[PDB]
A paper describes a structure:
The body of the structure is composed of two MBL/β-CASP domains of [name] (residues 1–506) and [name] (residues 1–449) facing each other in a head-to-head arrangement with a pseudo 2-fold symmetry axis running along their interface. The C termini of INTS9507–556 and INTS11450–502 extend from the body of the complex and form a tightly intertwined composite domain, hereafter referred to as the CTD1 dimer. The structure of the CTD1 dimer resembles a β-barrel with hydrophobic residues facing its inner core. An α-helical repeat that wedges between the two nuclease domains has been identified as the N-terminal domain of [name] (INTS4NTD), consistent with the visible side-chain densities, secondary structure predictions, and cross-linking and mass spectrometry data. Twelve HEAT repeat motifs (H1–H12) are well defined in our structure and constitute INTS4NTD, which forms a curved solenoid-like structure. The inner, concave surface of INTS4NTD is in contact with the MBL domain of [name], and H1–H5 interact with the INTS9MBL domain by forming specific polar contacts. Importantly, the simultaneous interaction of INTS4NTD with INTS9MBL and INTS11MBL via its inner and outer surfaces locks the relative orientation of the two nuclease domains, which would otherwise be associated loosely. The relative orientation of the MBL and β-CASP domains of [name] resembles that observed for CPSF73 (Mandel et al., 2006) and its homologs Ysh1 (Hill et al., 2019) and CPSF3 (Swale et al., 2019). In this configuration, a cleft leading to the active site is too narrow to accommodate the RNA substrate, suggesting that the nuclease was captured in a closed, inactive conformation.
Residue numbers in the entry:
A (entry chain B): 2 to 114, 117 to 471, 476 to 505
B (entry chain C): 35 to 180, 194 to 345
C (entry chain A): 1 to 61, 64 to 343, 372 to 556
């Protein structure tokens, strides 16, 4: 009755979220990722379990993937042919639609950078081995184990998954936002009482209101820039992140409106527009209602921007493509904005992508590119946590609703996690971990044995209960098939001994 | 027509023939003196009939006849009580208890009400019957005095079914609304069940916490509970806040109205409020501003 | 287990299951044949209605409130809808209500706002919304014209005995009520909690209910009510194959102790596909001759299946420039849902429609009943022209009732009823495999249909009990064994003391004490 959890890529390290979980006799991998900022050695978090059993299918019963981010599902196509996995890969319906979109786009950026990467061929192969699981739908993946989705917010398709085989439930909760950000209300999990709760610890410091604070900060920053041709250079790594940026720009225009200039994500913002409109069910309840009665996500400005914002020194509000990548549209945009007063750049996400993340952290003017390029920046660097995620207050709350026997911290930095772990240990009467990459926690539980009573017996004892001391006798019949509890007399009669 | 009806009831060919006739009679109204007629007849039939289905409707009919404007339910409450003692299926008994509650409210005389209450305390102890228990709680609550009643209700506060738990809370709540004064024992009991699994229970629980909070704001809770001693109302306000942040959309609605309605909260605690956690469902959001303005006056 | 049957009609059942100390109202349905019984009510005063005679019932009494059209009586009150009997079982005691299909969930707000009930209705997300816009559609139609002032005044038994055949056959007369307001609709929809498919929503820690996929139109949710020992399965609106909606979950409905089947083909000789084809032919023929086409349909289900075929025929026939004008308030909403999950829709008649009206067209109108809605008015305009046709696509209402008040009509009348719901052969094949021990289904299914002599009737090996109105029927199941889990740290050890009697049987003396927390059982040593 021991459940062994070993993060091969998650744990103390943020990104490459991969967590193997051995509830009873069943192994289940919780994600499989592409840690960014490294040319090699991090395409796929190394697979100890793979090295042991040649075929993954035999060793691994099942794989649940949280959502489309390259962090989580990025290296899901690794597994098409090379390590040769077959079985039900389980994502929510919104996830699986957008998952290939980001897979292929990264595939594109990788080949222009030779590298033995998955072609579209093998990405498609891997995608053909996928089962879509609706929200709050209990699906038995095996005879014994079953998995149920929950609403994780964060993005359309963020599924909080509870793998339960018997009475012991491990509920992973990765990238869940506990506030009603746009496109998403607050993430609800019911009172499962799972044995182990696994959480994202990206924010181990308690934050202000998710929406109001982020509006205030954005507006202030924009106004500050605007004085002398204030530029905008904002990285956006997701489809639903682009929409967020567009809404923020709309808000700016509403409050101010002094400068007409607006820019959009990229050429194919048509697509994002499309996808969001498609999945009305999953979106925030209120937002969906508003959409059924109002127009959603109008944008026709991207094309106008591109030409205007081709290395010229104006006010254009450009949210460029993949900011924290080796190359891309975003890198080009950053190079364009580099070394001018006009320029202000915002890091909307967590801005933790290996080397680029480190550069963001220390914000060194004398920054060195991977190639032999000398770029010196003299713009204003401000970071805001506008990224959809749960603050350390939020983590506390969800721990509350689940109220597990224990918690395990993955997907934050160790320092931050340490403090959070201490807090949770003090606050709720549970013992919580913060394991490193490749380190397993053998958290002992015990078996909870299900047996059937005779209804007569139960009734009688219940009656004894209410008038007040309540000792109850009787025997078990044990065929190992149908464990039953019967009365003294009844058992005697059953086995035929007078 | 009273004696014709008598004849029709027995002449039923099958159990389910009897059932329909009773049903049809339900749909024709009965005057003061014919209601006396039919009650008697319908009791007689009840004795002699072996199918529960029919017994159940007989009971429903009885209740309907009790509720008649002209009718006074005297000389047949004793009969009802007698049949209660010697009945055997929980559904029918619950229906009869419901009839008894109807009878109780029909005439406000002190003596008969008390008799009925005692009868229902007896029926309150019924076992593995979720429904007799609930009906009993309801009736106790409805026919109750102005202490013993209040003390009784806590027993069923801690009951197997959440369905009984709720009923108990509502019963106490009812006792308040007929001009009674609940005790601080009740307060502690209400604080003990604010964090039950079922959504119903939680809804009711805060309702009551608010009730007793308004009853004893001046009183204080001696227990430190990891801090220095503070006011009852202070703690009540706190507990109701927590509920705003609880994991349900309807539990929050309960909290919001009550949080706003709270008075003589200490200026410190009132200032500190996390009532600005308005989010998600926009019904709650709208609701929580309404009372904000009512009490910003204050 | 006692199941109380509270509604007569096979189509809308409202059957209340008392089981494992928890009672469930398996559906809430509004019948609507009573409404077809009353005289039709137009948006704008129609000459005929004003100039109609009485039926000369005489015998003293009423000549005001009974009329005569083509030798058939109607009543000069507002159409009144039959609703499931409320008397046999108290609503309070029926705990939660499960609601299967959006068509079958009407009359929810009657009960919730009229007769006392404090529980939580469980219905899957699509059906709630579709049903919401359908009741709003219904309320709008009856309240467009305030002619509800009048009283029926024919309900008396004596009056019924003397009056003629059409009215005579009302199974209940006294339970008829005028339609609920938009407030009650709102209350009803509010109390519904939206529960997805295959979701194990458990009530009061007693039984586990879950809405399985039925195969029928979007939101069609047959239900299984299991308790770890007895699985009771409820099988309404459960068309096998209807294309787009997720198919019927036969495997999930398998090995059910007690199967209740209620939704089934209104027409046994449906021949769905053929009728769709014929429909489109007829429409085409008439638009070609230059006469107009009228289709009385609802705002979901059948409407969209018929639209996809029409487009295809136009593509194949090149019969363009014939405006397909859909006229209904919630048309807006209807199309929106289709999107979420050359036709021009106008919420308001005498508006965009009037300005854009063209000489030939195919108009899909307000209500199939022909009593309340916009159909009435267009029916009147096109009645007097032989050219113009009316196609009844809807099975709910018999061909002949609509024809009855409007009997002197020139319009060519065509019947093209399409029901995707399981056929009797389909139900027969379903039930061999699903293999349930007792099945409960209305009398209607038990006997062959009145129309046809032939033995198409629903039969199972176990000879299934026939339901009926006001019939409380008790099936033959007593609970024999119920679950109880064993403690981990204290109990397991002491209760792991087996003493072997036989090779395959062991015996352990178990002593503990039981806490009955939230209706669950746990034995642990004191």
């Amino acid at each position: 009755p021991e459940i062994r959890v070993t993060p091969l890529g998650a744990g103390q390290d943020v990104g490459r979220s991969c967590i193997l979980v051995s509830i009873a006799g069943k192994n289940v991998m919780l994600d499989c990722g592409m840690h960014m900022g490294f040319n090699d050695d991090r395409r796929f978090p190394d697979f100890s379990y793979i090295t042991q059993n040649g075929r993954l299918t035999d060793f691994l019963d099942c794989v649940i993937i949280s959502h489309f981010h390259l962090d989580h599902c990025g290296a899901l196509p690794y597994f098409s042919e090379m390590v040769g996995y077959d079985g039900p890969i389980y994502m929510t319906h919104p996830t699986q639609a957008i998952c290939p979109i980001l897979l292929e786009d990264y595939r594109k950026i990788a080949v222009d950078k030779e590298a033995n990467f998955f072609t579209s061929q093998m990405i498609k192969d891997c995608m053909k081995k996928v089962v879509a699981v609706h929200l709050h739908q209990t699906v038995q993946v095996d005879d014994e184990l079953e998995i149920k989705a929950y609403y994780a917010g964060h993005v359309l398709g963020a599924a909080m998954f509870q793998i339960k085989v018997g009475s012991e439930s491990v509920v992973y909760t990765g990238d869940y936002n506990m506030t009603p950000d746009r496109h998403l209300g607050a993430a609800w999990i019911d009172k499962c009482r799972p044995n182990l709760l696994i959480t994202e610890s990206t924010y181990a410091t308690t934050i202000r209101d998710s929406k109001r604070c982020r509006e205030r900060d954005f507006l202030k920053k924009v106004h500050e820039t605007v004085e002398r041709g204030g530029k905008v250079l904002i990285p956006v790594f997701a489809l639903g992140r682009a929409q967020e940026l567009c809404i923020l720009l709309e808000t700016f225009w509403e409050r101010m409106n002094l400068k007409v200039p607006i820019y959009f994500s990229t050429g194919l913002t048509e697509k994002a527009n499309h996808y969001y409109k498609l999945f009305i069910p999953w979106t925030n309840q209120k937002i969906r209602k508003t959409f059924v009665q109002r127009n959603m996500f109008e944008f026709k400005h991207i094309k106008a921007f591109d030409r205007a914002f081709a290395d010229n020194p104006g006010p254009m509000v450009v949210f460029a493509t993949p900011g924290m990548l080796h190359a891309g549209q975003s890198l080009q945009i950053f190079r364009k904005w580099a070394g001018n007063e006009k320029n202000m750049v915002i890091m909307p996400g967590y801005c933790v992508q290996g080397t680029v993340g480190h550069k963001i952290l220390s914000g060194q003017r004398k920054l060195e590119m991977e190639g032999r390029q000398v770029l010196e920046v003299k713009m204003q660097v401000e970071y805001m946590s506008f990224s959809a995620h749960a603050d350390a207050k939020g983590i506390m709350q969800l721990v509350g609703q689940a109220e597990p026997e224990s918690v395990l911290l993955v997907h934050g930095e160790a320092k931050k996690m340490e403090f959070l772990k201490q807090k949770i240990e003090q606050e709720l009467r549970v013992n919580c971990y913060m394991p490193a990459n490749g380190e397993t926690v053998t958290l002992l539980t015990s078996p909870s044995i299900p047996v059937g009573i005779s209804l007569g017996l139960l009734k009688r004892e219940m009656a004894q209960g209410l008038l007040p001391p309540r000792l109850l006798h009787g025997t078990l019949i044990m065929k190992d098939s149908n464990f039953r509890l019967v009365s003294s007399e009844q058992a005697l009669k059953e086995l035929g001994l007078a | 027509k009273s004696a014709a009806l008598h004849i029709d009831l027995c002449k039923a060919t099958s159990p389910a023939d009897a059932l329909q006739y009773l049903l049809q009679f339900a749909r024709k109204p009965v005057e003061a003196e014919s209601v006396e007629g039919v009650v008697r007849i319908l009791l007689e039939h009840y004795y002699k009939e072996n199918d529960p289905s029919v017994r159940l409707k007989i009971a429903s009919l009885l209740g309907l006849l009790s509720k008649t404007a002209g009718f006074s339910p005297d000389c047949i409450m004793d009969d009802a009580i007698n049949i209660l003692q010697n009945e055997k299926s929980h559904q029918v008994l619950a229906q009869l208890l419901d009839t008894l509650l109807a009878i109780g409210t029909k005439l406000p005389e002190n003596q008969a009400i008390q008799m009925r209450l005692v009868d229902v305390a007896c029926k309150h102890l019924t076992d593995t019957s979720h429904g007799v228990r609930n009906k009993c709680l309801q009736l106790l609550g409805n026919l109750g005095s102005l202490r013993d009643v209040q003390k009784i209700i806590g027993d069923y506060f801690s009951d197997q079914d959440p369905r009984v738990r709720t009923a108990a809370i509502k019963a106490m709540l009812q006792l308040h609304e007929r001009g009674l004064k609940l005790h601080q024992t009740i307060y502690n009991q209400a604080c003990k069940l604010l964090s039950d699994d079922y959504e119903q229970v939680r809804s009711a629980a805060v309702q009551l916490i608010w009730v007793v909070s308004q009853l004893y704001p001046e009183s204080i809770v001696p227990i430190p509970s990891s801090n220095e001693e503070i006011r009852l109302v202070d703690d009540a306000f706190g507990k109701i806040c927590h509920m705003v942040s609880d994991g349900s959309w309807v539990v929050r609605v309960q909290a919001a109205k009550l949080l706003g309605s709270m008075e003589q909260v200490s200026s410190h605690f009132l200032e500190q409020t996390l009532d600005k956690k308005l989010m998600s469902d926009l019904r709650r959001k709208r609701t929580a501003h309404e009372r904000a303005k009512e009490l910003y006056s204050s | 287990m006692k199941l109380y049957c509270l509604s007569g009609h096979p189509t809308l059942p409202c059957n209340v299951l008392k089981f494992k100390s928890t009672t469930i109202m398996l559906d809430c349905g509004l019948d609507m044949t009573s409404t077809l019984n009353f005289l039709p009510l137009p948006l704008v005063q129609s000459p005929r209605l004003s100039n109609l005679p009485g039926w000369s019932l005489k015998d003293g009494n009423l000549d005001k409130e009974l009329k005569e059209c083509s030798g058939h009586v109607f009543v000069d009150s507002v159409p009144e809808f039959c609703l499931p009997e409320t008397e046999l079982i108290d609503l309070s005691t029926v705990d939660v209500i499960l609601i299967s299909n959006y068509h079958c969930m009407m009359a929810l707000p009657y009960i919730t706002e009229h007769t006392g009930f404090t529980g939580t209705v469980y219905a899957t997300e699509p059906t709630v919304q579709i049903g919401r816009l359908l009741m709003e559609e219904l309320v709008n139609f009856i309240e467009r014209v305030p002619k509800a002032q009048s009283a029926s005044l024919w309900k008396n038994k004596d009056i019924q005995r003397l009056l003629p055949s059409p009215l005579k056959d009302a199974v209940e007369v006294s339970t008829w009520r005028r339609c609920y307001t938009m407030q009650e609709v709102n209350s009803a929809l509010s109390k519904i909690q939206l529960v997805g498919y295959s979701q194990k929503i458990e009530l009061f820690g007693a039984v586990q209910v879950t809405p399985l996929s039925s195969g029928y139109a979007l939101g069609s949710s047959n239900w299984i009510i299991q308790s770890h020992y007895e699985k009771v399965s409820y099988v309404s609106g459960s068309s096998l194959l209807t294309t787009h909606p997720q198919p019927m979950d036969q495997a999930s409905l398998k090995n059910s102790d007690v199967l209740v089947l209620t939704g089934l083909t209104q027409i046994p000789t449906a021949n769905p596909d053929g009728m769709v084809g014929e429909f489109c032919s007829n429409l085409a023929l008439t638009v070609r001759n230059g006469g107009n086409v009228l289709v009385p349909c609802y705002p979901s289900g059948v409407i969209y299946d018929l639209l996809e075929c029409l487009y295809q025929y136009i593509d194949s026939a090149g019969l363009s420039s014939v405006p397909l004008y859909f006229i209904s308030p919630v048309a807006n909403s209807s199309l929106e849902f289709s999107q979420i999950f050359k036709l021009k829709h106008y919420p308001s008649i005498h508006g965009d429609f009037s300005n854009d009206f063209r000489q030939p067209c195919v108009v899909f109108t307000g209500h199939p009943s022909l009593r309340f809605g916009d159909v009435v008015h267009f029916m009147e305009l096109w009645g007097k022209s032989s050219l113009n046709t009316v196609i009844f696509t809807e099975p709910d209402f018999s061909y002949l009732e609509a024809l009855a008040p409007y009997q002197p009509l020139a319009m060519k009348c065509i019947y093209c009823p399409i029901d995707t719901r399981l056929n009797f052969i389909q139900v027969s094949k379903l039930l061999k495999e699903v293999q349930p021990l007792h099945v409960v289904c209305p009398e209607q299914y038990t006997q062959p249909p009145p129309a046809q002599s032939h033995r198409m009737d629903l039969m199972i090996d176990c000879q299934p009990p026939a339901m009926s109105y006001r019939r409380a029927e008790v099936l033959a199941l007593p609970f024999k064994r119920r679950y109880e889990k064993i403690e981990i740290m204290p109990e397991l050890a002491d209760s792991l003391v087996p003493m072997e009697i036989k090779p395959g049987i062991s015996l352990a003396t178990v002593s503990a004490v039981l806490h009955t927390k939230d209706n669950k059982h746990l034995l642990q040593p004191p």
